[PDB]
Design a protein around this nucleic acid. Structure first.
Ligand code: MN
Lengths: 161, 612, 612, 161
DNA sequence: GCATCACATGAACTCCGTGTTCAATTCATTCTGATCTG
DNA sequence: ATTGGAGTTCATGTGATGC
DNA sequence: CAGATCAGAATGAATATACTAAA
């Protein structure tokens, strides 16, 4: 409620909607800030969250993004690998990530080789952008100073093979 | 009372180590009555009782169930034999070692038997096979106390073996029966397919009767993993991508392009974005330059295979006429026998005189003259095959002697034999990196410093390029022009034997160290060939075999089927059925599919009518 | 009706050859009941009756000599009792041949016997063994005329064997029981000394386990040769040389190095004074010029010892391997008998025909065709010994049917024969002497005029050097620099296999076929290990054991006892002494030596313990 | 007369001490040149050789010897041959002789081929150096016209050993 | 203690172009570690 | 000094036993 | 302050009683 609810929301940036809150397990007089996120690390943010991203990210009008935010992953691919084969050392690995907020998806390209997300990671893994993020025309750049992995499951199938 | 206890293992060094831990007094040594791996003895106390510890390690592992029935025969045998009609028993194989003395030593009599062989399924197989031979010859099993004692050591580890000495027990059963059942399955399937390939595949072709098809539970999947890459090559599906191009300005005389260190990208817009970040260059930085020294190695003695390969390449013309020239040359006689398979150059050969007979034909000239002068270096050591000495010219000729393609061939051998003795070609491989924007591009080049054998075979020579202007780190070196390019190709790079290894453990069929021997088997069976660059392109026999498999019966390929049978013969641990049904139902479904496979030899016969 | 005559040859091939000439094409050949030697029957005449001839070929030694099996138990009695308390019998060697049973089953009713074994030594044993085997077999000597006839053929040629069956003879028991004596004496000496040594030295020194210590009439000297070589190599005092060198130029870009007539001086200050008297000059004058020519000697026929020597030195092959390869080539029907001693070719041998057959191999097609033109030169008048003809190729063979050791050994066999009937190489040696101060210096050089056998055997070719420029008396060539050189006395290197043959044949340690066996024997017992360059290095165990013999009793190791025993048994061969009594005298003296060796063995143990 | 005989022996080269001459003689009686020569040849040179060399012989200051002189050779070794192969013919023979006078031992190198004196020469043999003697660096060079061995017998201290 | 007999066994005589796996010791090569100076 | 190999059956040495 | 210069681990060819001598 009120102040404590706002503080709990703003602490993690997990802007869960009221409908998602009432549909999920949010027991009154049981927990306020801790167990809600502790169980939300395995909840469908795509359905329980609001579009705190702008309206026209892919348009290119928006330049810079600031503030700590947490999002899910839907389609992460190495932009420098052929369709048939995805894993190789024939070129530096540049990761293209379809990055989901709940209503307006986007895509981010990884600059620095980071050994925290692999090409086999399950979709829906939590990735938290923390800092200044720059989009060039319709794609957002990544860096280790921005992305922090948390992990989770989007309650889906394997969507593989 | 002073009794005697014998211990069995298989490794001499492990035997010495376990003797050392058992007594710390090195025991005493008796010369090996088995002919190898001398045995040891001590006056120890196994369960605190005075017992002669006589310990031995066998030199091998008796194996080869094979047939033990003359019903094996040959072509004039009942086909049902290869399905199920085979009285199966194991033979005391490879008596070239002995194992008769092994049985004699295991005889006589022992109070207790201790087994310490390999701690795996195969080791348990050896253990049980030794057990069923030592029990019939031991003294007696008087009393309810057991006489078999198995340790639980994992590997060479002092504390582990020390505690395993107390960790005694009886070896677990049915693992040996699982593994030997796997062996008889391999026996039956391989024998079946070999018999009917000898029956039908040869087809009285005359030329193909000499060749043999050696089928196995894994040979066909290995050939399939050699050929599917060729299949995807025939698919020939191209690709599309982008390349970033830029220029760092020179002194206005030369040019200095770069290579976009983040080489290659598969996109339409991210490359455009990088261009947006790399279309307002104003200044560059010299972040790092490198200059190493590596030497190209001198060539080897020419084989028949290498000669044929370069002659199909290089001057370029087919193997049949290549072999025709080889013979005419051996005839007017300028070269030794052209069927070499060695690279040894035996010491008897007169290197000095051989190099001496060439004092003409100015193509080779004062160069080879000074090579005659001073000192000549030893050639590379090769392999001895015992066929005949390698190719080498004798009593050199000139332009008007041979002529045409025969002269071209003789020129090849002459140049290669000149190259066989020389100094290595040394060069400096320099590279300088230019830092612009969020990019750290790099350019590279080579500069030869010593020609060496480069002086004799231009077709194998380092290319000539201008030396990059080496400078200190952090210089300005501004930019010129930048560009966005495109380049694409086929599905490239028919991969090599290393990738064969990698995919081979990837699918999961094979054993601990038998991958090379399967590769050698499948190559001597004339299914694939060895090509320069360690390439493993298959041959006509292999490709027609795999195509005939795929067209009608892919089940026998089914690269996961061998792993499936392995896992269902691994699940036979613990409580389960009999081996009889497990083998019988599988083999009978395969043999029904195989009966109508024989009823459908058509596919292979049309493949023969197409390609032979 | 007709009578039957049985004849047996020593070797199967000579057997078929004798059949070829005798029956002039009337062969009735069929393999005998042994799988080793066939039987040839035909019809002819003998002393005026039309009779039938059957002939076979014993495959070697019919019987060998060995003691009673009880004393072969290795522990029944002390080897001393072997001297005069050990009855000895004869047993059929190589029972796999089943020669005794073959000669028992074949021979019934053969009234007359004629014997065609070799007329030298070591054949009388075999002839009398065959005789004593066949006497209880035929149809009894009812006729008063004797039936045992001996054939005395000198050379294996058509006319000689014609005279051979024209006139026959009778064997010589007196000289048969001389080689009998030598064989038995060697047997007892070995079976005593080697047994006692291997029993003692392994008694307490544990390192001598799993090894055999041997002693005898030939093994000990063939070890002692290399032993003395090693002793001389170790015991050496290095010194230094002092040589003066002169350097001159003739016209331009020409360098000549003079040579001092006084090749070396062994003193530093004396060399310094010689240099002092020499340096003060600038001119040199020619005194004596030469235009003398010489010739190089063409090789004889390839003897067995020489063939082994060249195979070891040039081809890098062990003597046993070389003998085995020669045996294989012989049994396949390419070259004629490996183990031969005679050098001179038969007078009636068709030298031209053999050269005619080998004219299509490309390696010699130019040189063999040229040699056929002027006519073959007569072979060198060498030496004869009444044995089989020397080694020669018998029919052409291209490399296809031959492999490795093939074009190796066979290639030398043929090249030796073409060189045998070829001409000689003519070379000119010119020596020009210069005067430097009061001293004398000269230069030497050689040149080729008309190569003879050097055009077929490259390794035995005159070295090529720049010819000295022409000079005339009274000119003063410009004098360059001089330089004194300090050298060192090079110690002798390790003994080579080629030198061992010289030390073997010259002292007559073994026979033609015994030499390869003994060299293999000493190498196998870990006495001496071969190394790079086919040199023999004695082992630590070998060195310590041999030296004790030198300091105890040299009468068992000096390379003269073999000559002594051989020279003292030929007296029996001519019947100059008593066969029974001489053996006792030889046995008696050796009996004393054996007791002394037992008595004088303690000091050897002191020498043994230094190594271990 | 005494000085006439001394001059005759000087012309023959022979230089001896007085004490030497009355020591060699069997008796101080009438003497002739032949008998005194033979009786001194019997005797050793160590006690009878007077000071007749001008010294400085070892050093290079000396350059030549004139007139008839008398010397001896004590030890002979072939400097032109090795020591282990003492009788090797790999080189032309060229000896060095340890030439003594009763006062000093010098080196005489055989410069010309010669056969009247060999390796197995009786040591202590008498030699005459009439006329020209080439002393190059303080060491003497033999010749076939001046260096003449006259033979002689002395107490054989060598016994070849 | 001795003659006997049947059984194991060695040898003489005769009739008639398979997967899997190692596999029991110690070369000369061939791809991994210490040290001043532009 | 330099030769085809496998299965069968028969003679023989010997160990076990009975007299 | 690591090329040019010298040193260790993996790769990979290695055989073992019978007595002497000699066809
Ligand atoms: Mn013979």
């Amino acid at each position: 409620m009120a102040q404590v609810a706002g503080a709990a929301l703003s602490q993690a940036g997990w802007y869960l909607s009221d409908e998602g809150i009432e549909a999920c397990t949010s027991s009154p007089d049981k927990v306020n800030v801790n167990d809600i996120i502790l169980i939300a690390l395995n909840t469908d943010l795509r359905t329980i969250g609001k579009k705190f991203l702008p309206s026209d990210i892919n348009s290119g009008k928006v330049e810079k993004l600031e503030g700590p935010c947490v999002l899910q992953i839907q389609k992460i691919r190495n932009v420098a690998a052929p369709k048939d084969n995805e894993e190789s050392q024939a070129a530096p690995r540049m990761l293209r990530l379809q990055m989901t907020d709940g209503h307006i998806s986007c895509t981010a390209v990884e600059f620095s080789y980071m050994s925290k997300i692999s090409l086999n990671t399950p979709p829906g893994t939590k990735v938290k952008l923390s800092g200044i993020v720059d989009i060039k025309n319709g794609f957002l750049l990544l860096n280790d100073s921005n992305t922090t992995v948390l992990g989770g499951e989007v309650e889906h199938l394997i969507e593989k093979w | 009372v002073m009794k005697t206890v014998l211990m069995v293992a298989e490794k001499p060094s492990l035997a010495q180590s376990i003797a050392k831990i058992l007594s710390r007094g090195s025991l005493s040594s008796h010369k090996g009555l088995n002919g190898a791996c001398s045995v040891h003895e001590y006056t120890g106390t196994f369960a605190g009782q005075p017992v002669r510890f006589k310990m031995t390690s066998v030199c091998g592992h008796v194996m080869t169930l094979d047939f033990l029935g003359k019903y094996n025969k040959w072509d004039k045998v009942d086909p049902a034999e290869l399905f199920s009609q085979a009285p199966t028993e194991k033979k005391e194989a490879n008596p070239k070692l002995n194992m008769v003395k092994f049985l004699q030593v295991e005889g006589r009599g022992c109070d207790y038997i201790v087994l310490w062989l390999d701690c795996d399924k195969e080791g348990e197989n050896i253990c049980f096979e030794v057990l069923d031979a030592v029990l019939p010859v031991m003294n007696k099993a008087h009393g309810g106390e057991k006489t078999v004692f198995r340790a639980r050591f994992s590997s060479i580890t002092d504390t582990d073996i020390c505690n395993a000495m107390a960790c005694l027990g009886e070896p677990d059963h049915n693992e040996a029966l699982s593994v030997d059942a796997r062996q008889e399955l391999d026996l039956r399937i391989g024998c079946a397919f070999t018999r009917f390939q000898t029956k039908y595949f040869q087809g009285k072709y005359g030329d193909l009767d000499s060749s043999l098809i050696s089928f196995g539970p894994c040979q066909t999947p290995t050939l399939g993993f050699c050929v599917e890459r060729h299949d995807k090559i025939q698919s020939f599906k191209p690709e599309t991508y982008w390349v970033l191009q830029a220029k760092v300005n020179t002194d206005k005389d030369r040019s200095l392009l770069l290579d976009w260190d983040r080489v290659r990208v598969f996109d339409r817009e991210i490359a455009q974005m990088f261009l947006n970040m790399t279309k307002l260059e104003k200044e560059a930085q010299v972040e790092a330059t490198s200059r190493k020294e590596k030497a190209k190695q001198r060539p080897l003695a020419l084989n028949t295979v290498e000669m044929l390969r370069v002659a199909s390449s290089s001057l370029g013309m087919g193997p049949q006429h290549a072999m025709q020239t080889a013979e005419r040359l051996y005839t007017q006689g300028y070269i030794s026998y052209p069927r070499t398979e060695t690279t040894h150059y035996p010491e008897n050969f007169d290197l000095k005189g051989s190099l001496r007979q060439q004092a003409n034909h100015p193509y080779w000239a004062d160069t080879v003259k000074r090579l005659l002068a001073e000192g000549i270096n030893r050639p590379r050591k090769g392999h001895d095959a015992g066929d005949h000495p390698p190719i080498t010219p004798m009593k050199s000729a000139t332009e008007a002697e041979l002529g045409g393609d025969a002269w071209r061939l003789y020129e090849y051998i002459t140049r290669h034999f000149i190259a066989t003795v020389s100094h290595d070609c040394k060069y400096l491989q320099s590279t300088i990196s230019f830092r612009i924007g969020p990019e750290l591009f790099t350019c590279s080049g080579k500069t030869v410093l010593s020609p060496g054998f480069t002086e004799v075979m231009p077709w194998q020579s380092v290319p000539l390029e201008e030396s990059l202007p080496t400078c200190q780190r952090g210089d300005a070196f501004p930019v010129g022009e930048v560009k966005m390019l495109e380049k694409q190709t086929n599905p490239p790079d028919y991969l090599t034997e290393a990738e064969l290894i990698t995919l081979m453990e990837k699918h999961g069929i094979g054993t601990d160290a038998s991958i090379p021997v399967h590769i050698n088997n499948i190559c001597q069976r004339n299914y694939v060939t060895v090509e320069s660059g360690r390439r493993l392109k298959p041959t006509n026999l292999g490709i027609v075999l795999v195509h005939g498999y795929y067209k009608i019966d892919a089940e026998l390929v089914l690269p996961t089927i061998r792993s499936a049978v392995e896992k269902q013969l691994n699940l036979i641990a613990q409580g389960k059925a009999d081996y009889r049904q497990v083998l019988g139902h599988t083999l009978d479904v395969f043999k029904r599919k195989f009966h109508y496979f024989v009823d459908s030899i058509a596919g292979m016969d049309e493949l023969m009518e197409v390609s032979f």
